[PDB]
Ligand binder design. Sequence first.
Ligand SMILES: COC(=O)NC[C@H]1CN(c2cc(F)c(N3CCS(=O)(=O)CC3)c(F)c2)C(=O)O1
Ligand SMILES: [Mg+2]
Ligand SMILES: [Mg+2]
Ligand SMILES: [Mg+2]
Ligand SMILES: [Mg+2]
Ligand SMILES: [Mg+2]
Ligand SMILES: [Mg+2]
Ligand SMILES: [Mg+2]
Ligand SMILES: [Mg+2]
Ligand SMILES: [Mg+2]
Ligand SMILES: [Mg+2]
Ligand SMILES: [Mg+2]
Ligand SMILES: [Mg+2]
Ligand SMILES: [Mg+2]
Ligand SMILES: [Mg+2]
Ligand SMILES: [Mg+2]
Ligand SMILES: [Mg+2]
Ligand SMILES: [Mg+2]
Ligand SMILES: [Mg+2]
Ligand SMILES: [Mg+2]
Ligand SMILES: [Mg+2]
Ligand SMILES: [Mg+2]
Ligand SMILES: [Mg+2]
Ligand SMILES: [Mg+2]
Ligand SMILES: [Mg+2]
Ligand SMILES: [Mg+2]
Ligand SMILES: [Mg+2]
Ligand SMILES: [Mg+2]
Ligand SMILES: [Mg+2]
Ligand SMILES: [Mg+2]
Ligand SMILES: [Mg+2]
Ligand SMILES: [Mg+2]
Ligand SMILES: [Mg+2]
Ligand SMILES: [Mg+2]
Ligand SMILES: [Mg+2]
Ligand SMILES: [Mg+2]
Ligand SMILES: [Mg+2]
Ligand SMILES: [Mg+2]
Ligand SMILES: [Mg+2]
Ligand SMILES: [Mg+2]
Ligand SMILES: [Mg+2]
Ligand SMILES: [Mg+2]
Ligand SMILES: [Mg+2]
Ligand SMILES: [Mg+2]
Ligand SMILES: [Mg+2]
Ligand SMILES: [Mg+2]
Ligand SMILES: [Mg+2]
Ligand SMILES: [Mg+2]
Ligand SMILES: [Mg+2]
Ligand SMILES: [Mg+2]
Ligand SMILES: [Mg+2]
Ligand SMILES: [Mg+2]
Ligand SMILES: [Mg+2]
Ligand SMILES: [Mg+2]
Ligand SMILES: [Mg+2]
Ligand SMILES: [Mg+2]
Ligand SMILES: [Mg+2]
Ligand SMILES: [Mg+2]
Ligand SMILES: [Mg+2]
Ligand SMILES: [Mg+2]
Ligand SMILES: [Mg+2]
Ligand SMILES: [Mg+2]
Ligand SMILES: [Mg+2]
Ligand SMILES: [Mg+2]
Ligand SMILES: [Mg+2]
Ligand SMILES: [Mg+2]
Ligand SMILES: [Mg+2]
Ligand SMILES: [Mg+2]
Ligand SMILES: [Mg+2]
Ligand SMILES: [Mg+2]
Ligand SMILES: [Mg+2]
Ligand SMILES: [Mg+2]
Ligand SMILES: [Mg+2]
Ligand SMILES: [Mg+2]
Ligand SMILES: [Mg+2]
Ligand SMILES: [Mg+2]
Ligand SMILES: [Mg+2]
Ligand SMILES: [Mg+2]
Ligand SMILES: [Mg+2]
Ligand SMILES: [Mg+2]
Ligand SMILES: [Mg+2]
Ligand SMILES: [Mg+2]
Ligand SMILES: [Mg+2]
Ligand SMILES: [Mg+2]
Ligand SMILES: [Mg+2]
Ligand SMILES: [Mg+2]
Ligand SMILES: [Mg+2]
Ligand SMILES: [Mg+2]
Ligand SMILES: [Mg+2]
Ligand SMILES: [Mg+2]
Ligand SMILES: [Mg+2]
Ligand SMILES: [Mg+2]
Ligand SMILES: [Mg+2]
Ligand SMILES: [Mg+2]
Ligand SMILES: [Mg+2]
Ligand SMILES: [Mg+2]
Ligand SMILES: [Mg+2]
Ligand SMILES: [Mg+2]
Ligand SMILES: [Mg+2]
Ligand SMILES: [Mg+2]
Ligand SMILES: [Mg+2]
Ligand SMILES: [Mg+2]
Ligand SMILES: [Mg+2]
Ligand SMILES: [Mg+2]
Ligand SMILES: [Mg+2]
Ligand SMILES: [Mg+2]
Ligand SMILES: [Mg+2]
Ligand SMILES: [Mg+2]
Ligand SMILES: [Mg+2]
Ligand SMILES: [Mg+2]
Ligand SMILES: [Mg+2]
Ligand SMILES: [Mg+2]
Ligand SMILES: [Mg+2]
Ligand SMILES: [Mg+2]
Ligand SMILES: [Mg+2]
Ligand SMILES: [Mg+2]
Ligand SMILES: [Mg+2]
Ligand SMILES: [Mg+2]
Ligand SMILES: [Mg+2]
Ligand SMILES: [Mg+2]
Ligand SMILES: [Mg+2]
Ligand SMILES: [Mg+2]
Ligand SMILES: [Mg+2]
Ligand SMILES: [Mg+2]
Ligand SMILES: [Mg+2]
Ligand SMILES: [Mg+2]
Ligand SMILES: [Mg+2]
Ligand SMILES: [Mg+2]
Ligand SMILES: [Mg+2]
Ligand SMILES: [Mg+2]
Ligand SMILES: [Mg+2]
Ligand SMILES: [Mg+2]
Ligand SMILES: [Mg+2]
Ligand SMILES: [Mg+2]
Ligand SMILES: [Mg+2]
Ligand SMILES: [Mg+2]
Ligand SMILES: [Mg+2]
Ligand SMILES: [Mg+2]
Length: 46
Amino acid sequence: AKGKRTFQPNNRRRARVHGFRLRMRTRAGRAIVANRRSKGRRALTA
RNA sequence: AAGUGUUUAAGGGCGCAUGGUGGAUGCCUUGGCACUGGGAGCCGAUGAAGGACGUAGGAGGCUGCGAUAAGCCUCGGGGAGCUGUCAACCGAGCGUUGAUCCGAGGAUGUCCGAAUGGGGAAACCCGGCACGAGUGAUGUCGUGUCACCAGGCGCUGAAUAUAUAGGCGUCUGGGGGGAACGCGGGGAAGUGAAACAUCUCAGUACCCGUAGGAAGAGAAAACAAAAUGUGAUUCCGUG
RNA sequence: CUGCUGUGAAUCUGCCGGGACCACCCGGUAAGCCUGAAUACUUCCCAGUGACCGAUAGCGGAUUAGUACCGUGAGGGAAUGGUGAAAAGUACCCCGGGAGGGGAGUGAAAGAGUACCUGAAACCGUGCGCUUACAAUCCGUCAGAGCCCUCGACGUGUCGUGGGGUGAUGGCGUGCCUUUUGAAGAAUGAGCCUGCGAGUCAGGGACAUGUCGCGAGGUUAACCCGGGUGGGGUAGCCGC
RNA sequence: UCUACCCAUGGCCAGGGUGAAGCGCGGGUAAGACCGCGUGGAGGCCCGAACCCACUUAGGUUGAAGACUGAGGGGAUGAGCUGUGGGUAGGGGUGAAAGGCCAAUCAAACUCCGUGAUAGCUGGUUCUCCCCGAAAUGCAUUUAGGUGCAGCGUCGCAUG
RNA sequence: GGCAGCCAACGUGUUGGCUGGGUAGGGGAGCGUCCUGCAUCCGGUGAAGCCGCCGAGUGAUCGAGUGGUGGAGGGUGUGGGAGUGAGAAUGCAGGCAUGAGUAGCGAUUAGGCAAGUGAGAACCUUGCCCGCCGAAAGACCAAGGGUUCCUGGGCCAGGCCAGUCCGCCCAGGGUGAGUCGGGACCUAAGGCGAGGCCGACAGGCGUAGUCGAUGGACAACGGGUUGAUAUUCCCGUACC
RNA sequence: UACCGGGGUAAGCCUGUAGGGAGUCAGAUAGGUAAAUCCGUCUGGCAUAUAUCCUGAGAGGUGAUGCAUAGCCGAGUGAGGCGAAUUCGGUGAUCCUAUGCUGCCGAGAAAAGCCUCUAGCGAGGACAUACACGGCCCGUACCCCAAACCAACACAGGUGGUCAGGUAGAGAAUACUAAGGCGUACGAGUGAACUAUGGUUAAGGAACUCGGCAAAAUGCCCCCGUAACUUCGGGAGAAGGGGGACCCACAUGGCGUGUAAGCCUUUACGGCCCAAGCGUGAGUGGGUGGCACAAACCAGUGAGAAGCGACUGUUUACUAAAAACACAGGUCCGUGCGAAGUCGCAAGACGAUGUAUACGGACUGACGCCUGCCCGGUGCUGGAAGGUUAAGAGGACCCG
RNA sequence: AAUUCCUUGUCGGGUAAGUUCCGACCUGCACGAAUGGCGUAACGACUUCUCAACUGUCUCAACCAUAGACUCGGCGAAAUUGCACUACGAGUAAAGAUGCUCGUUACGCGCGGCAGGACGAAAAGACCCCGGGACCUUCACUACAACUUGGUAUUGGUGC
RNA sequence: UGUCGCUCAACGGAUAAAAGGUACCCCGGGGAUAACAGGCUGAUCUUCCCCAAGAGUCCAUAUCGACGGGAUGGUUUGGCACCUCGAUGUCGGCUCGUCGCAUCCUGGGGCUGGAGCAGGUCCCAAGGGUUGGGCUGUUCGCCCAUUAAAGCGGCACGCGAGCUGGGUUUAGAACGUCGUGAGACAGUUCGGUCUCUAUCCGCCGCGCGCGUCAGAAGCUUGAGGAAACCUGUCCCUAGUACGAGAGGACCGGGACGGACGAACCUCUGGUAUACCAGUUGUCCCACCAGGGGCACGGCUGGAUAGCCACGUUCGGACAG
Ligand SMILES: COC(=O)NC[C@H]1CN(c2cc(F)c(N3CCS(=O)(=O)CC3)c(F)c2)C(=O)O1
Ligand SMILES: [Mg+2]
Ligand SMILES: [Mg+2]
Ligand SMILES: [Mg+2]
Ligand SMILES: [Mg+2]
Ligand SMILES: [Mg+2]
Ligand SMILES: [Mg+2]
Ligand SMILES: [Mg+2]
Ligand SMILES: [Mg+2]
Ligand SMILES: [Mg+2]
Ligand SMILES: [Mg+2]
Ligand SMILES: [Mg+2]
Ligand SMILES: [Mg+2]
Ligand SMILES: [Mg+2]
Ligand SMILES: [Mg+2]
Ligand SMILES: [Mg+2]
Ligand SMILES: [Mg+2]
Ligand SMILES: [Mg+2]
Ligand SMILES: [Mg+2]
Ligand SMILES: [Mg+2]
Ligand SMILES: [Mg+2]
Ligand SMILES: [Mg+2]
Ligand SMILES: [Mg+2]
Ligand SMILES: [Mg+2]
Ligand SMILES: [Mg+2]
Ligand SMILES: [Mg+2]
Ligand SMILES: [Mg+2]
Ligand SMILES: [Mg+2]
Ligand SMILES: [Mg+2]
Ligand SMILES: [Mg+2]
Ligand SMILES: [Mg+2]
Ligand SMILES: [Mg+2]
Ligand SMILES: [Mg+2]
Ligand SMILES: [Mg+2]
Ligand SMILES: [Mg+2]
Ligand SMILES: [Mg+2]
Ligand SMILES: [Mg+2]
Ligand SMILES: [Mg+2]
Ligand SMILES: [Mg+2]
Ligand SMILES: [Mg+2]
Ligand SMILES: [Mg+2]
Ligand SMILES: [Mg+2]
Ligand SMILES: [Mg+2]
Ligand SMILES: [Mg+2]
Ligand SMILES: [Mg+2]
Ligand SMILES: [Mg+2]
Ligand SMILES: [Mg+2]
Ligand SMILES: [Mg+2]
Ligand SMILES: [Mg+2]
Ligand SMILES: [Mg+2]
Ligand SMILES: [Mg+2]
Ligand SMILES: [Mg+2]
Ligand SMILES: [Mg+2]
Ligand SMILES: [Mg+2]
Ligand SMILES: [Mg+2]
Ligand SMILES: [Mg+2]
Ligand SMILES: [Mg+2]
Ligand SMILES: [Mg+2]
Ligand SMILES: [Mg+2]
Ligand SMILES: [Mg+2]
Ligand SMILES: [Mg+2]
Ligand SMILES: [Mg+2]
Ligand SMILES: [Mg+2]
Ligand SMILES: [Mg+2]
Ligand SMILES: [Mg+2]
Ligand SMILES: [Mg+2]
Ligand SMILES: [Mg+2]
Ligand SMILES: [Mg+2]
Ligand SMILES: [Mg+2]
Ligand SMILES: [Mg+2]
Ligand SMILES: [Mg+2]
Ligand SMILES: [Mg+2]
Ligand SMILES: [Mg+2]
Ligand SMILES: [Mg+2]
Ligand SMILES: [Mg+2]
Ligand SMILES: [Mg+2]
Ligand SMILES: [Mg+2]
Ligand SMILES: [Mg+2]
Ligand SMILES: [Mg+2]
Ligand SMILES: [Mg+2]
Ligand SMILES: [Mg+2]
Ligand SMILES: [Mg+2]
Ligand SMILES: [Mg+2]
Ligand SMILES: [Mg+2]
Ligand SMILES: [Mg+2]
Ligand SMILES: [Mg+2]
Ligand SMILES: [Mg+2]
Ligand SMILES: [Mg+2]
Ligand SMILES: [Mg+2]
Ligand SMILES: [Mg+2]
Ligand SMILES: [Mg+2]
Ligand SMILES: [Mg+2]
Ligand SMILES: [Mg+2]
Ligand SMILES: [Mg+2]
Ligand SMILES: [Mg+2]
Ligand SMILES: [Mg+2]
Ligand SMILES: [Mg+2]
Ligand SMILES: [Mg+2]
Ligand SMILES: [Mg+2]
Ligand SMILES: [Mg+2]
Ligand SMILES: [Mg+2]
Ligand SMILES: [Mg+2]
Ligand SMILES: [Mg+2]
Ligand SMILES: [Mg+2]
Ligand SMILES: [Mg+2]
Ligand SMILES: [Mg+2]
Ligand SMILES: [Mg+2]
Ligand SMILES: [Mg+2]
Ligand SMILES: [Mg+2]
Ligand SMILES: [Mg+2]
Ligand SMILES: [Mg+2]
Ligand SMILES: [Mg+2]
Ligand SMILES: [Mg+2]
Ligand SMILES: [Mg+2]
Ligand SMILES: [Mg+2]
Ligand SMILES: [Mg+2]
Ligand SMILES: [Mg+2]
Ligand SMILES: [Mg+2]
Ligand SMILES: [Mg+2]
Ligand SMILES: [Mg+2]
Ligand SMILES: [Mg+2]
Ligand SMILES: [Mg+2]
Ligand SMILES: [Mg+2]
Ligand SMILES: [Mg+2]
Ligand SMILES: [Mg+2]
Ligand SMILES: [Mg+2]
Ligand SMILES: [Mg+2]
Ligand SMILES: [Mg+2]
Ligand SMILES: [Mg+2]
Ligand SMILES: [Mg+2]
Ligand SMILES: [Mg+2]
Ligand SMILES: [Mg+2]
Ligand SMILES: [Mg+2]
Ligand SMILES: [Mg+2]
Ligand SMILES: [Mg+2]
Ligand SMILES: [Mg+2]
Ligand SMILES: [Mg+2]
Ligand SMILES: [Mg+2]
């Protein structure tokens, strides 16, 4: 009986790992935002 | 007496007649696809591309707009109906003294975003200075302005003498985005070779730096072959 | 021709090219810069076209679509169009808690009722006819009794150049596909229906073979001029 | 955001045993060594809940559950367990080392792109009829279930 | 007695002789589907599609032969062009069978009766009993969730049965702080990082700084009140 | 006389008890990136006091004529009014004094804040009382061991922290139970086989089986009594055995606590003693009852010997927990210091704010007794007399 | 012997009976000294053998309760599936027949049960072979990083 | 033009240039190809036979039968590669069986180098029976007590959609050995997931329907099936027959058992969830007394009926 799942939600950690400001820090992340915008995604980031 | 002999359908099968389910088929379309001829080929610190949150007399989505919020002003068009739409229903109003609507030019344009007063988990937290408003005063509220770097111009010139590095002040720029096309750099592998390393795939995919409306190239230290030759570059057809 | 690393000249008798190199001729004048047109492309805007698609097609997206939904994230990523000319969308009555239905209305039609054009098949019912509970069945086929229906002539049913439905009973009879020397095979694939799903296209390409034009000649490429599919264009190419 | 290890900062460990060093006193001695009796409360110490494990067994095995449940079992002041916040990234990480683990996937994660990768291999390839009609041999082969040429089919032309 | 291929014989297409099992495979000739140039014809006096009847051809198949359904296009001839034919790929999408009215309906506590509500009650409400947890199955939070909370209404989806009930559907309402938990205070690991150093470019590190609680500092307690908030509102008494 | 329910009330502000912690004044100084009366350091004088001061549980007072409450009125929508007593003891924390104290080795954040010192500001300024005022932003509903979070489900799994009633009990185990909360969402029947989960069993007692797998057994407290061997710690709860209930007496006893009275004094939040009252074992003697006195639940099986590994630990998330890994201990090799090693293209970083008693790598693996022979092969270390050997130099001779 | 092929070696012990176990012998297929040798108190959910106690493990099984199973009401799946009014024997066949031959047996339809067959279901056999991958090794080949040699540039002066 | 340079010898000559491991394995394929089972064959194996050289004092043939020869069977090891690699799970044990006779016991016989008892060998016979333990994963085998006897084989070496999982044969680890190494070993050692709700046939049970020439009811015949079928010891006959003795019967009678099966519950014994009693902890019924709830039916001592075996009774014939 270990029963611990992989997804342990934490909103701060979500933002710090996947958030808008993180993405914008690097060229790769900025490319991600541009690509999702080009696809027409409503949500560009976490 | 012996012998002959129909006569059940619990249920099933097959055929037909009537239905259900389902959404094929036929015929369509407010949507696509491939192209042709034109236009425009950039937008951004005067804050972009794209967003968050708001905004109509009534809940939400799409559309429009930004606290002046389905809108404000001006110049033109237009001519009887209008208050975007899903979407009506109710409740109120405008318009021949020209509404709704269409075109052009202005005004307003919260917050986030290069994001740039400082900070931050984008759209939310906290300020300096100047002017104004408001308080009995503190608190509070408007409107400007305050990142960094590069390059002009002015002042100053450390250790240290000459000086210089640097430090103040001020003006002018840059930053980010965009489907393809350009130029200059970096540069695979699957694969082919019926194995594989040279070679191929291929200077392809991808990546980096920069453009422009196109770019690059361009005005012979060129070709040619004895012809009394041609005469910048680019691009197309041949060879 | 050109990068990096060394070395390192001449100013016209100079120097650099004419596929190692040398000589002779020829061409040109490096180590400075700028330069339009012919060429490439279309996020976006305007006007059009199609021997292009027509809702499992065409864009992933005709429907809140890059949405719902999936993933921590990069990222992945659907499904859903048609009433009728007009909403005239069924007042009112009846059964029912509703749902739904039956009368009555509207409509050309409700065999058009917001579950809506047409309404196939699988699949699921109800009714009628024949058949089936002593039988061993790849499920059918060829003979065939009996019953039911129908078309002719005759008469009360009975026969025919008949036609259908069902079928007691007899003979014969080992699914389909793939793949194998050989499979009913106890080898592979298929639960069923509907829809979709595989030799296509480009190039004066190559060889062959039809066909058409011209013929010792045939033909143009780019390009130019026509709102066209037409006219022009000799560079080439292939024969000789 | 699972998991491995590390960094910073917090929390948690019922109850009951055992009795190290040190200290004190009394024996003992010339002084000691040494020996009793207290005090003391040490330890990857003992028994045992929470908590952390997963040893044996039965059940589950289209589960209640993509790893669990019941019954017993081990550790339980420590190389302990745990919260919050943080760090290391793919030929790389981390590993008290099982090639373990790195989001139910690991002898090289996942996603998109090159990309419709390539398969001498397996499967599939859809209407009809008319005429003809094979081969499973020879030679060679990084060849033996592949392929080239020959042999054997067909269509056309020629020769009869 | 019908059809066909090859060949012969003559004729302005008939007669005769021979031949006609067939996988891989070669050759020949056709059927059906769609889109089109041209020419013709049919169609609200009812096109296509679909379901039948009665018939037809050597086959793919046909019916400008006819009923029913249906509602707007279709046929034919001759040419041009194909997303042109499926039964099978453990093929794909949708619909639906078989297993089958079968297995299950998710613990280790357990329900019973009376009365009420209602169209309907084993499951909803109230009362009286019974049973279970009680280092929890009680009470209060962080994380996470996001209106699930309260009142009124609802009962065709959802709830593994039913349902008048619901954590489900609908409308309205509800969250009040100088002291609580955070910011405006402080720093840890770590992150970012003016200049800077390093690195072909992309970038890698890092100084001054500036962020970053799980820690440091810092002022409120008891009582009452709403259907739903309370160290927040109110009362009493405090503190910064 | 028996029984049931009450037998309540915070922060703050007074007061400064238990406990803990402290010497003070004077002279000199540029060590504290300038200065200092502060701090540090050095020299002198005066101190061992219940002296003084700081800190601090709690008792007591106030807060409180208030608030709250057992009940009682009527009256039911459930709102409203009235409202007693409130003493003394015992027991007792995992909470407080306590960031204390004592012990130990592994030697145990930072910054703000607060205090103080000058530098530097200064003509105005400090303090107290009264009155009138400002005190921003975000969260605040509800669930939160769960059908509201992570689990595709109204899923037997998972989820950190804070409260801890009573009787048995060592206990937060376990049994029953209070407050509070549930009966949790398919049911009703029915003695089929069979499966699952529990229960009992004549006689026998491992004959079962790969194997005592699974069950059964042992189990608590207080006494008695315990071997080989040993690293002298252990082994050890070794083994083996006895007692345990209830009533009465000893007992107006013993022990803990401690009021009245009394005694002492530094008279106060003092000290000594203490009948009563309350709580509480252990033992001894006699009796009483049962089949059974650890009464249920709870709760070691023990012994002899061998192999491996010394030991506590660690490991294949999801078939292996071990003899594998780790380990303390050992030896070798490297490393003289932005070391060696490692990450990185570099800068830079870790190693380490370490310096050979250190750090890295390798093999071995507590401890005891020990660890022989071989340097031919292949590595590693050192050497360079020979053989061979790149680019760079040279440039004979030859060829156009 | 965790090492011994022959091998259940041989002798002793334990048992009524011992291929395992304990003590020895040495004929070590094929122990041996930090891939340490031989021992070792303590320790072990390790592995092995023996004994006491205890028992449904067994002789040998019986009975009780609960949850399913079963019946009634409600809701309502799944894997599988070319067909179907799906007997048996002895044969025959791609050599193991419900489906072919000859014969035998058998009224139609269900319910509860058992698992011999349907070469039952699941999963394009993990074995083996053929073709292709991957990762690992090394005195296989060819490269590259890193390290290292000399020349030359940065790089100079005076002396021997 | 002439000629030279290749153990390119894998010699039609893939590169000028190349070895291994995988039990950590993965994918595409094959029953074109092995490991299990089936099938063919039958060398080998097995069972029997033909000839009779000899052995047996003499005497081939009571009993053995050399050298050679001919076959059966198809359970051994093989040979072959025909079905199955889009899956036919293995050894041993357990449970349940079913068939053959080449018969282990019991039954019936011939011949004996059969006096008797007890045997040897061959023929006929398959109804029933054919034990429990120690060692090993074992099959096999050896051993310990018994027995009338402790038969040999087939059925996918019967039986894992019935169970087990000790051996073997995944991944961990270790020893010896081999390999420079990754690794390897029909060498050894410790450890290591055994899935499935039964549609069809088949089998065990139980109903519904219809039929058997009207609708019903009681009692029946038995075509045809199924079950059952074992055996010992002791005492008489008899210490007789036979025999030197030792020893010791056939045939025919009687009693008492083992194993197995059936029915049954009087007895003995087991069970007992609404029976009675005792008793611990706790909560409750205000309280005492008396009771109840919960803790395995709390625990403990008993326990009629039902069900049951360890119990009771009966069976296997007798005759044709
Ligand atoms: C594991 O299941 C299957 O592969 N199923 C598919 C086929 C193959 N097969 C089978 C079974 C076996 F047990 C063996 N054995 C015997 C024991 S052994 O001596 O260890 C050697 C291996 C075999 F070779 C083939 C079967 O039954 O069907
Ligand atoms: Mg421009
Ligand atoms: Mg900003
Ligand atoms: Mg910033
Ligand atoms: Mg100067
Ligand atoms: Mg730019
Ligand atoms: Mg290749
Ligand atoms: Mg290839
Ligand atoms: Mg230009
Ligand atoms: Mg030249
Ligand atoms: Mg230029
Ligand atoms: Mg359609
Ligand atoms: Mg579409
Ligand atoms: Mg993922
Ligand atoms: Mg998401
Ligand atoms: Mg109509
Ligand atoms: Mg419909
Ligand atoms: Mg319709
Ligand atoms: Mg009949
Ligand atoms: Mg027959
Ligand atoms: Mg026949
Ligand atoms: Mg074959
Ligand atoms: Mg063939
Ligand atoms: Mg088949
Ligand atoms: Mg079949
Ligand atoms: Mg195959
Ligand atoms: Mg299939
Ligand atoms: Mg311990
Ligand atoms: Mg673990
Ligand atoms: Mg099951
Ligand atoms: Mg233990
Ligand atoms: Mg413990
Ligand atoms: Mg300690
Ligand atoms: Mg993190
Ligand atoms: Mg391994
Ligand atoms: Mg994983
Ligand atoms: Mg790889
Ligand atoms: Mg490619
Ligand atoms: Mg392909
Ligand atoms: Mg022919
Ligand atoms: Mg060929
Ligand atoms: Mg033919
Ligand atoms: Mg013929
Ligand atoms: Mg063909
Ligand atoms: Mg047609
Ligand atoms: Mg009409
Ligand atoms: Mg049409
Ligand atoms: Mg097609
Ligand atoms: Mg189809
Ligand atoms: Mg299909
Ligand atoms: Mg069905
Ligand atoms: Mg069934
Ligand atoms: Mg059933
Ligand atoms: Mg059921
Ligand atoms: Mg339930
Ligand atoms: Mg009622
Ligand atoms: Mg209920
Ligand atoms: Mg209870
Ligand atoms: Mg509610
Ligand atoms: Mg309500
Ligand atoms: Mg409902
Ligand atoms: Mg329902
Ligand atoms: Mg920092
Ligand atoms: Mg940095
Ligand atoms: Mg910078
Ligand atoms: Mg901060
Ligand atoms: Mg904090
Ligand atoms: Mg509330
Ligand atoms: Mg007080
Ligand atoms: Mg009072
Ligand atoms: Mg609340
Ligand atoms: Mg949920
Ligand atoms: Mg749950
Ligand atoms: Mg408890
Ligand atoms: Mg529930
Ligand atoms: Mg239930
Ligand atoms: Mg039962
Ligand atoms: Mg017994
Ligand atoms: Mg007994
Ligand atoms: Mg035994
Ligand atoms: Mg046995
Ligand atoms: Mg044994
Ligand atoms: Mg056990
Ligand atoms: Mg037990
Ligand atoms: Mg001992
Ligand atoms: Mg007595
Ligand atoms: Mg160990
Ligand atoms: Mg221990
Ligand atoms: Mg351990
Ligand atoms: Mg595991
Ligand atoms: Mg395990
Ligand atoms: Mg270094
Ligand atoms: Mg070494
Ligand atoms: Mg070791
Ligand atoms: Mg031995
Ligand atoms: Mg021995
Ligand atoms: Mg040595
Ligand atoms: Mg050694
Ligand atoms: Mg060792
Ligand atoms: Mg263990
Ligand atoms: Mg039941
Ligand atoms: Mg039912
Ligand atoms: Mg058969
Ligand atoms: Mg047939
Ligand atoms: Mg079953
Ligand atoms: Mg069969
Ligand atoms: Mg199968
Ligand atoms: Mg395969
Ligand atoms: Mg293999
Ligand atoms: Mg390879
Ligand atoms: Mg050759
Ligand atoms: Mg040759
Ligand atoms: Mg070659
Ligand atoms: Mg495979
Ligand atoms: Mg074969
Ligand atoms: Mg098999
Ligand atoms: Mg075989
Ligand atoms: Mg077979
Ligand atoms: Mg062959
Ligand atoms: Mg198959
Ligand atoms: Mg015989
Ligand atoms: Mg008989
Ligand atoms: Mg077998
Ligand atoms: Mg089986
Ligand atoms: Mg291994
Ligand atoms: Mg070696
Ligand atoms: Mg184990
Ligand atoms: Mg084993
Ligand atoms: Mg009879
Ligand atoms: Mg019969
Ligand atoms: Mg019986
Ligand atoms: Mg009786
Ligand atoms: Mg009673
Ligand atoms: Mg009471
Ligand atoms: Mg009483
Ligand atoms: Mg109770
Ligand atoms: Mg009893
Ligand atoms: Mg009894």
